[PDB]
Design a protein around this ligand. Structure first.
Ligand SMILES: N=C(NO)NCCC[C@H](N)C(=O)O
Ligand SMILES: N=C(NO)NCCC[C@H](N)C(=O)O
Ligand SMILES: [Mn+2]
Ligand SMILES: [Mn+2]
Ligand SMILES: [Mn+2]
Ligand SMILES: [Mn+2]
Lengths: 295, 297
């Protein structure tokens, strides 16, 4: 039950937010042995590197910071995924900030027929459903799921071949929610477990709910923001939020997601090794290992 | 910088069975730890990595003329066949070892990838000629035999890995300085082209490169097999058989830079890094050599 190949896309993207270092996520996971983890799962790894923009960061007040760089990266990412996505193998995107989630989901959508049903599990402290009109920061990493459902600037929403819908989303771990996001979650009845919910009901129930929700879907895509995890375990990340998912629960979650036959693509985002390298990187590699059944 | 390809093929070859020390099978893993993939990122947006199966059997540590023959055979066959599929005259293939017994598989693979009438040139950068046979080997370690096997001198199970043999006229040695009785015989009897490390010091690496360019004009492709113990032990400590009075790091970097400019070079082996002997100084100097090959300083 081993794969013929893993497609590994490194996405050195920082322009969805303001802190330097998140673009070196892939390079530092490699340093800590990511390729050796992939070696236990496939003899062939096809690595792709998305071009890193090199322009000066826009660090002032704006409603949509460094839109050119988020657009260019997400388009390249979408088109690379569209070509490499394969229901018999595994695709792993390593970020980079969570603005790349627009590109990853667009790419899965592009790879499938127009009538396909694509499910998204979004493991995160944040719903990432703000727009430039309500964003508290102007940081596009807080907007990708809004763009994916068609709420956002044209330059970004048009990256989607067509929109997913709020019924396609399952949140896991959310706990830092803005006014506009609370409105969307309640108004559109978006399925979710907050971190408190997880603590109360257990991760076994979360997995059962995911299995039931996506039973009639064609594929599932997992987008795993490491800041979903409690900051005791994950320090090297730009927006840590207390009272997160335990590492034990996160490993179980990844292990169970990895057994889902409809899952063929996973994003691992928001590792900033310049904030903290070793404890964080090693816990990230545990999560990835657990996804693959290693540990 | 300098070198851009559509793709690099990277084959990790975790082979220790050509010799007796543990750790040389972890060469690839430790070069990755030190940033090998980031080096490849400067050269291509696509890297196709393959990993050759690591055997897990006990090392054969008694008296024999050809130690762990099953494990060297198995790895070299898989290596040959993987290279045969991925070898490409418009891109680059890099095999990271692992001990030098893998040089039989790498050369066989280049030969298999080409037409049966192709002329394949080999530059062998090494302290050792690696042209012993089981009958004259002082150790029974197959890492000292691959070039003998490639020219058809060796046990059938290894020589038959070659689709056809290369000949001693196809070889250029650089850096050789530790030579056994049987290797000295082959070098002088077959007039094998070489520069010893002392030769290099006397004539300069510029002359070595010119001789390589001139020799391989008649050939279709060149394959470089780079044993890090060619380099002086001041710079390369993490290796199983270090030999003093080696090629300077400066000359080795120049050598790699110039090899990388050769249009006929489409495949390179980097062998004999044993990080369990010494990890950091060695690994970082190995990555400099690889970087220089690609034009990065
Ligand atoms: N770490 C990222 N993605 O999960 N956080 C994004 C949202 C932070 C905050 N809600 C904002 O829009 O500024
Ligand atoms: N370091 C490796 N690859 O060059 N081999 C060295 C062999 C030493 C000696 N000639 C022997 O056959 O045992
Ligand atoms: Mn996120
Ligand atoms: Mn987040
Ligand atoms: Mn050698
Ligand atoms: Mn040697």
């Amino acid at each position: 039950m081993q794969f013929e190949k893993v497609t590994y896309i490194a996405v050195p993207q920082k322009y969805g937010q303001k802190k330097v270092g998140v673009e070196e996520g892939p390079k530092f996971l490699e340093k800590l042995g990511f390729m050796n983890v992939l070696e236990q799962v496939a003899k062939s790894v096809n690595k792709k590197t998305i071009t890193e923009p090199k322009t000066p960061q826009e660090l002032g007040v704006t409603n949509a910071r460094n839109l050119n760089e988020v657009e260019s990266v997400n388009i390249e990412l979408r088109d690379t995924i569209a070509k490499e996505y394969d229901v018999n193998n595994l695709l792993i995107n390593i970020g980079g900030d969570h603005s790349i989630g627009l590109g990853t989901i667009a790419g899965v959508v592009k790879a499938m027929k127009p009538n396909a049903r694509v499910g998204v599990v979004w493991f995160d402290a944040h719903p990432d459903m703000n727009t430039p009109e309500n964003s508290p920061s102007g940081n596009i990493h807080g907007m990708p799921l809004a763009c994916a459902v068609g709420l956002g600037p044209q330059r970004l929403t048009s990256i989607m071949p067509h929109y997913i819908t709020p019924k396609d989303i399952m949140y896991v771990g959310i706990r830092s929610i803005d006014v506009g996001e609370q409105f969307e979650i309640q108004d559109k009845h978006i399925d979710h477990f907050t971190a408190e919910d997880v603590k109360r009901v257990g991760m076994k129930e979360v997995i059962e709910a995911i299995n039931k929700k996506f039973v009639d879907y064609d594929v599932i895509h997992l987008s795993f923001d490491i800041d979903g995890i409690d900051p005791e375990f994950i320090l090297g990340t730009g927006t840590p939020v207390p009272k997160g998912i335990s590492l034990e629960d996160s490993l179980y979650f990844m292990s169970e997601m990895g057994k889902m036959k409809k899952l063929h693509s996973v994003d691992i985002v928001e590792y900033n090794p310049k904030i903290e390298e070793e404890i964080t990187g090693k816990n990230v590699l545990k999560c990835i290992s657990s996804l693959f059944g290693i540990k």
